[PDB]
Design a protein around this ligand. Structure first.
Ligand code: BOG
Ligand code: MYR
Length: 310
């Protein structure tokens, strides 16, 4: 019957629009708003034949800040943090290979050592020779290695709840791992809210339709993310022997109630760094630059002012 088929067309039309098209445009609209408010726009560049997506803003005449997201995250983690920075800095935030909109070759290495070399190659690819680095979690682990390996390029380093040391207190993540639980890998749609609860003390407001799509995207990425996470475990590079090689002023910034990586990490790193600064934000979780962006950016600007002003 023509009507049964016609009705079949509309039913699929509405379903395809509801299930696929509306969520995607929703994400594109929110990205448009948050990137636009931060003065950031998206580009891509091929680095060792991998497509690396990145955001860029501010004047190229100003010093470059290169921002590196953590495990399972992407460059949009940095939008609200970057907003007060693009007035005075050339801000760049990339998607690491394996994440976001960048290439994800199935057979590549995604250890932080290999990733740190890709980031250095990326900086050269966009014509940046001297820069400030900031990295969160896995991205901080990577940023620290970049700074240790290429001291001539790095003007300052900000480690925002970075991975890479073994502190006195075992974090809730590392506790979870002993029982085969990893909140950072979202297997089921309900585990996405669990991930947010795990990394935020006070979670920023998130519209329900946007949240569900983010959760769907996280589930779709979970198998590959789990494989990368296994490489981060098996190909782990301790920072303790590397930190003394860093010449740059280094900011250690933590959320005091970080459940993923413990604040006692700072006591490991501080004695090992030539020029450490410290900020511990109160009642804050693992991603201060997302949870309290303007506050975190203000601490970072203060740090940068000191680095420049003397
Ligand atoms: C919880 C993890 C971080 C969430 C980031 C929220 C991104 C979208 O957040 C929404 O954006 C709107 C316009 O930009 C705001 O006006 C809304 O209040 C906010 O819910
Ligand atoms: C512009 C809309 C993008 C929405 C961003 C949602 C925030 C993602 C939460 C992940 C936080 C980082 C987790 C980690 O570093 O381990």
């Amino acid at each position: 019957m023509k009507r049964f088929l016609l009705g079949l067309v509309l039913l699929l039309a509405v379903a395809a629009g509801v299930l696929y098209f509306v969520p995607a445009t929703l994400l594109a609209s929110v990205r448009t708003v948050e990137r636009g408010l931060a003065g950031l726009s998206e580009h891509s560049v091929q680095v060792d034949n991998l497509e690396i997506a990145y955001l860029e803003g501010g004047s190229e005449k100003n010093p470059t800040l290169l921002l590196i997201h953590g495990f399972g995250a992407d460059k949009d983690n940095w939008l609200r943090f970057a907003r007060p920075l693009t007035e005075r800095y050339h801000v760049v935030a990339l998607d690491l290979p394996g994440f976001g909109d960048s290439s994800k070759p199935q057979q590549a290495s995604y250890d932080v050592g290999t990733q740190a070399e890709r980031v250095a190659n990326f900086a050269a690819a966009i014509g940046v020779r001297r820069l400030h680095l900031a990295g969160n979690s896995m991205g901080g682990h990577i940023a620290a290695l970049y700074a240790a390996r290429h001291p001539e390029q790095v003007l300052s380093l900000a480690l925002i709840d970075n991975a890479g040391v073994m502190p006195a207190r075992k974090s809730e993540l590392f506790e979870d791992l002993e029982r085969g639980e990893n909140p950072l890998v979202v297997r089921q749609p309900e585990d996405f809210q669990k991930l947010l609860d795990f990394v935020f003390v006070q979670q920023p407001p998130l519209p329900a339709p946007l949240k569900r799509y983010l959760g769907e995207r996280a589930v779709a990425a979970s198998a590959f993310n789990a494989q990368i996470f296994e490489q981060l475990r098996q190909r782990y590079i301790p920072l303790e022997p590397e930190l003394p090689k860093i010449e740059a002023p280094t900011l250690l910034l933590w959320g005091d109630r970080d459940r993923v990586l413990d604040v006692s990490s700072i006591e490991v790193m501080r004695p090992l760094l030539k020029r450490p600064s410290v900020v511990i934000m109160e009642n804050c979780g693992h991603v201060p630059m997302v949870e309290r962006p303007e506050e975190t950016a203000q601490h970072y600007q203060a740090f940068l002012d000191g680095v420049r002003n003397a």
